[PDB]
Amino acid sequence: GSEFRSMTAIEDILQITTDPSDTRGYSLLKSLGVDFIDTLLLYQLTENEKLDKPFEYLNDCFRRNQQQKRITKNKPNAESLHSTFQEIDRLVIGYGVVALQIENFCMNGAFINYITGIVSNVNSYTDFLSQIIQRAILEGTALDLLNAVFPTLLEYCNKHVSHFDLNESVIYNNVLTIFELFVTFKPIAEIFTKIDGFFADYSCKPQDFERKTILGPILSLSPIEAAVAIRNYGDNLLRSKQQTAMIHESLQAEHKVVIDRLFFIVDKLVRGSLNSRTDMISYFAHIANKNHLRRADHPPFKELSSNGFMSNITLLLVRFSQPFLDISYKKIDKIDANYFNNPSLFIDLSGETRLNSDFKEADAFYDKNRKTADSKPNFISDCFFLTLTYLHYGLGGTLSFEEKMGSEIKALKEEIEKVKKIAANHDVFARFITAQLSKMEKALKTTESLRFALQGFFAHRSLQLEVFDFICGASTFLIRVVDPEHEFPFKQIKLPLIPDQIGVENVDNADFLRAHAPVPFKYYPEFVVEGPVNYSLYISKYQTSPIFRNPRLGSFVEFTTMVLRCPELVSNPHLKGKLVQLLSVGAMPLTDNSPGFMMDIFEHDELVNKNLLYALLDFYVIVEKTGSSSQFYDKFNSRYSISIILEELYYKIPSYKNQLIWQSQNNADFFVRFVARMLNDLTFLLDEGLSNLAEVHNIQNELDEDKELQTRLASASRQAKSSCGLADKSMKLFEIYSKDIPAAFVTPEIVYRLASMLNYNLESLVGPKCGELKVKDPQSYSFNPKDLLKALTTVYINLSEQSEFISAVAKDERSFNRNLFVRAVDILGRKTGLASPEFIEKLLNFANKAEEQRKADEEEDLEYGDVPDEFLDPLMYTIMKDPVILPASKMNIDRSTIKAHLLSDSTDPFNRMPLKLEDVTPNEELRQKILCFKKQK
């Protein structure tokens, strides 16, 4: 009849009949109408041993029932078919839910098998699952649905695949699909973080975070995973830049999609509920808290999370932050500056060096804040600071890992070549050496493959741009934390924060500065500044650096300049050393000889151009008083950098050239402090650069204990290139500067020392000291003797019409001899870079005027020079009667003279230090000779 059309439709949907003779492969059951289909089902699922895939079945049913409809509605007869089509949907989905809720309610297979099927062809369980989910939430039970499909998805990703990575294109892509599908339902999102095993096992090792944790496997999908790296590049490491660049574009494309989907998933979880996003922060916090050694010198790699894993989480956190740090800076208040005021609840700051303070101080500062709430985890700002801690330990850890690769590869190739030369006679030894060699080759492949993979990741513009932008945004935020009246970047900031030390000549400001450092900023963890700098100096080597002409550079260049301007902000000089090195990268002229990419900001950025020059000159001096256990060559590398910036700022930006000159006239004490250090260093630089250079030969010599004999030669040549380098760059500054302000270089405290330094180096450059040196390839160590001799002589010439200077050069007994200038011309007449002969002529004029004056004094003495100089008063020039030793300068002077000087001045005539005619210790011993002389003769 028609109550038949029902029993018939139930047959073709559930594929099961009752007549032992059916013309179709329907299951026969053995042991009503539509109240009988619940019974039919419970059987197919708990009795029929022929059903190995209960779930794949329930889905095919649901799948056919939904087709019976797509054709039953296109007919006039379609009514009693609704009474049934409905009870199907009620029990197919209703059971589909028990399948994924009760471990083994089915006859064949368990959770693992069903979700394995789902993962295989996911687009076919999409509708059914969707319905199973809705069912779950409406009926209450949903956590149970999750505790069945996700811990399982984890076991599947770990044990039922060979490797869950970017190579299993279908499997990972489908596993993400079931994450999205499942998490786009908000009632799930607000509960997701409760799933068994969503957190680390409190005994779980950091390498397993991305393995035994729910979000583990998918957060790791990335192209900088060894497996992917060798599959894609280890394939042919000899391919061309074109083909290489090809696979890079490809992998980049794939990664952009995976982090976009990765974000999508965690964003839904963050929006789920305060309890969820808080849990998301805890999860990420714990991962970071236990991966600090990722940033160690020799990281225990197999005991730490993967670079892919940590790098992705960084890109993610950089996105949850993008909103607060957009160029309008309107939301910049949601980030609590006092974040570090109370003990932390997530990021573990124990053992974290702070900007300008220490443990006792930070711990104590916690107490001065007892009366405020401890647990007030503002998400917005936990996210921000977690991003910074990840920028350091995650991205920072990854970037350092690749920077060291070239040097690793060199060493490996050398090692295998050594091993390759061994001749193993005995079969067991021959088999041994081959294994040794084999393992080394495998290591090499892994590294070269990884190097390409990693290179394609930092060269992935789109992604790196999100990172630097975060940095620039974070910069602006930190400036506001320093700014007394926290209002930057709305209301500008006034530097210096505390008046500059006119009296900077005191006991290590170290303690004074720390005491006057900004109340909140001083307690901030150091990584907040190291992270941005390390990354920035790093990606700067990339053709696609995000930093290049990025419209937000100013925000960073400002923060940098501020730190370099107020010594109390960050105490670590090694750190500020990096900052000054970055600035030098943005000063270097493009090969188009056009201004560095940072030159424009240097010139027009209000904050920058007002404090840059001063900061550089003050820091040039401040690094001297430092170093920390052979962190000795930092002060010189920091100066090499400052020099570069100084040389360029002077050539290309009148604005700065003016400030220099100004500084020298309106603040000579400060400008002299600077040139004085540049002067001192120049007395020995060329000397040791020359000595380290002699060694980089005494070592290449014994090369017809090597291991350390070679690390010694590599330390020697580095100190050479570093010394000859600063030498050349410092002479250029004396040349350049003397041309416009010769007066500044003839002040009493600089002139005599300046003359002696010049004659001394001139002696080196013109004689055997440089003339016998036989270095491999000069240029490699920044050693251009002839170019340096030119900057030297040009300096003489820029000062030659300064009486005091020519006088000094003439009186320098130690190393002045006109002949030196002679052969200086003669050997400047070798390579043609001598702006001569008008130069070679200007030089000889000086060389003679000096010789003139020299003889004038040698005779002036011989004739009217009886009374030995030590018996003469320094200010009255008469013979001394009551010799007395000043104590502040050890200068001898007549009782009468100081006594008479004192009447209107209680300072020492020479070195301006207070005193009283009492502190003046008489000098009898002297007045002794002053008699047997004043009498004898």
Sign of the torsion angle spanned by Cα atoms 659, 662, 666, 671? positive
* DSSP H or E stretch at residue 894: strand 892-894
The 892-894 sheet, strands edge to edge: 892-894, 883-885, 921-922
CB count in 10 Å sphere of residue 587: 21
921 pairs with which residues across the strands?
A: 885
What does DSSP say about strands 883-885 and 892-894: parallel, antiparallel, or unpaired? antiparallel
- From the list 850, 849, 687, 857, the residue with the least C-alpha distance to 763 is 687
Which structure tokens are listed for 336?
Answer: 């609590």
E-strand stretches of 13-97: 16-17, 27-28
Cβ proximity of 891 and 883 under 8 Å? no
525 pairs with which residues across the strands?
A: 354
Cβ proximity of 476 and 332 under 8 Å? yes
Cβ proximity of 573 and 639 under 8 Å? no
DSSP characters over 563-581:
HHH-TTS---HHHHHHHHH
Cβ proximity of 500 and 362 under 8 Å? no
Residue 782 region, left (φ>0) first, then alpha (ψ -120 to 50), else beta?
Answer: left
Distances (CA, A) of 449 to 224, 438, 910: 9, 17, 68
Cβ proximity of 493 and 482 under 8 Å? yes
Report CA 522 to chain centroid distance, whole Å: 20
DSSP 29: P
How far is 444 from 439, CA to CA, in rounded Å?
9
Omega before residue 837 within 30° of 0, cis:
yes
How far is 2 from 897, CA to CA, in rounded Å?
136
How far is 835 from 838, CA to CA, in rounded Å?
7
Rounded to 5°, the CA angle 234-390-515 comes to: 140
Name residues whose C-beta falls within 8 Å of residue 310's C-beta, 6 or more positions apart in sequence.
287, 291, 294, 390, 393, 394, 395, 397, 398
Residue environment code for 607-643, b if the CB has 16+ CB neighbours within 10 A, otherwise e: bbbebbbbbbbbbbbbbeebeeeeeeebbbbbbbbbb
Length of the chain: 937
How far is 447 from 441, CA to CA, in rounded Å?
10
Resolution of the entry in angstroms: 2.7
Distances (CA, A) of 270 to 150, 279, 807: 18, 9, 77
How far is 889 from 908, CA to CA, in rounded Å?
8
Rounded to 5°, the CA angle 439-444-445 comes to: 100
Position 31, amino acid: S
Distances (CA, A) of 710 to 165, 366, 698: 41, 50, 12
How far is 876 from 589, CA to CA, in rounded Å?
55
Which structure tokens are listed for 20?
Answer: 């032992």
Query: CB-based burial of residue 925 (10 Å sphere; 0-12 exposed, 13-18 middle, 19+ buried)?
Result: exposed
CB count in 10 Å sphere of residue 703: 9
Report CA 47 to chain centroid distance, whole Å: 63
How many Å is the Cα radius of gyration of the chain? 39
Cβ proximity of 143 and 191 under 8 Å? yes
Residue 593 region, left (φ>0) first, then alpha (ψ -120 to 50), else beta?
Answer: left
3-state class (DSSP) for residue 872? strand
Report CA 221 to chain centroid distance, whole Å: 24
What does DSSP say about strands 16-17 and 921-922: parallel, antiparallel, or unpaired? unpaired
Distances (CA, A) of 358 to 363, 369, 388, 511: 8, 17, 20, 12
3-state class (DSSP) for residue 330? coil
CB count in 10 Å sphere of residue 537: 18
- Angle subtended by helix axes 54-72 and 111-120, to nearest 10: 50
Largest CA distance in the chain: 156
Which structure tokens are listed for 51?
Answer: 């059903």
Cβ proximity of 555 and 473 under 8 Å? yes
Which structure tokens are listed for 183?
Answer: 């998490």
Position 628, amino acid: S
How far is 571 from 563, CA to CA, in rounded Å?
10
How far is 817 from 759, CA to CA, in rounded Å?
9
3-state class (DSSP) for residue 879? strand
| Structural domains for the chain | 1-865 (no CATH), 866-937 (3.30.40.10)
- From the list 175, 163, 174, 311, the residue with the least C-alpha distance to 231 is 163
CB count in 10 Å sphere of residue 672: 17
Cβ proximity of 758 and 683 under 8 Å? no
**Three-class SS of 329-377:** CCCCCCCCHHHHHCCCCCCCCCCCCECCECHHHHHHHHHCCCCCCCCCC
How far is 747 from 750, CA to CA, in rounded Å?
6
Query: CB-based burial of residue 931 (10 Å sphere; 0-12 exposed, 13-18 middle, 19+ buried)?
Result: exposed
How far is 243 from 119, CA to CA, in rounded Å?
34
892 pairs with which residues across the strands?
A: 885
For the chain, the first-to-last Cα distance in angstroms comes to 156
